[PDB]
Design a binder for this molecule. Structure first.
Ligand SMILES: CCCCCCCCC[C@H]1C[C@@H]1C(=O)O
Ligand SMILES: CCCCCCCCC[C@H]1C[C@@H]1C(=O)O
Ligand SMILES: [Fe+3]
Ligand SMILES: [Fe+3]
Length: 222
């Protein structure tokens, strides 16, 4: 079941998935620095999280070089453009809860699910790097959960709306790269299950009850 990491078929799919990961890590660095403009008293903790994202970017860049793959960065920039646009719109409006739901909840849960699914089908070099990034993703999820938990009563409506707009985008993003992910021996159903578990757990921690979490699923489905 392990892929042939040397095949042209594998390298071609890896060129796009690796580019998406590298671009995602860079955008995550930029997103945490940007949140510092909304939360000036959190600048030092946000700088620490952003520095972790740059370490992740460096490690994943090394994964592609190790396999002799040239990352398709243009494809990766286009892939993230709709979610990037929604983050920038919220940032411009000073909508800290939306920025945090996009980056610290949705994007971190997408990273955790992708990395968890990739680990068992990864080459030995990339496996160690990916295992070494996972604890940081939980730190990032925890940062977003803690702020949203502390501020839940002022932003329930905004979070429902951020979810309605951005959760279907994450679903479309998975559909776009499910083909390449299957070449990497990653199952779309496992990617979805892990993402939903992480996202449900974050919403529970923040303070949403079962009905409210189901309302968020209903809003995204409508
Ligand atoms: C189907 C597998 C596609 C891989 C998607 C990976 C998205 C990158 C997630 C990184 C930006 C998140 C972070 O570092 O917090
Ligand atoms: C990596 C996993 C990304 C897919 C998770 C998205 C869950 C789908 C939930 C409802 C909002 C989707 C829709 O039908 O538009
Ligand atoms: Fe990261
Ligand atoms: Fe992260």
């Amino acid at each position: 079941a392990l892929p042939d990491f040397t095949s042209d078929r594998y390298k071609d799919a890896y060129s796009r998935i690796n580019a998406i990961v590298i671009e995602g890590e860079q955008e995550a660095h930029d997103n945490y620095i940007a949140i510092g403009t909304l939360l000036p008293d959190h600048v030092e903790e946000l700088k620490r999280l952003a520095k972790m994202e740059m370490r992740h970017k460096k490690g994943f860049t090394a994964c592609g070089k190790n396999l002799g793959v040239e990352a398709d960065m243009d494809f990766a920039r286009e892939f993230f453009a709709p979610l990037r646009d929604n983050f920038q719109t919220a940032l411009g409006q000073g909508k800290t809860p939306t920025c945090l739901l996009i980056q610290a909840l949705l994007i971190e849960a997408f990273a955790i699910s992708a990395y968890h699914t990739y680990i068992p089908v990864s080459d030995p070099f990339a496996r160690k790097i990916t295992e070494g990034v996972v604890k940081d993703e939980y730190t990032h999820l925890n940062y977003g959960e803690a702020w949203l938990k502390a501020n839940l009563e002022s932003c329930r409506e905004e979070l429902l709306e951020a979810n309605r707009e951005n959760l279907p985008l994450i679903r479309r993003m998975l559909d776009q790269v499910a083909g390449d992910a299957a070449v990497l021996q990653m199952d779309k159903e496992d990617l979805i299950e892990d993402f939903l578990i992480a996202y449900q757990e974050s919403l529970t921690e923040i303070g949403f009850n079962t009905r409210e979490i189901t309302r968020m699923a209903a809003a995204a489905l409508v």
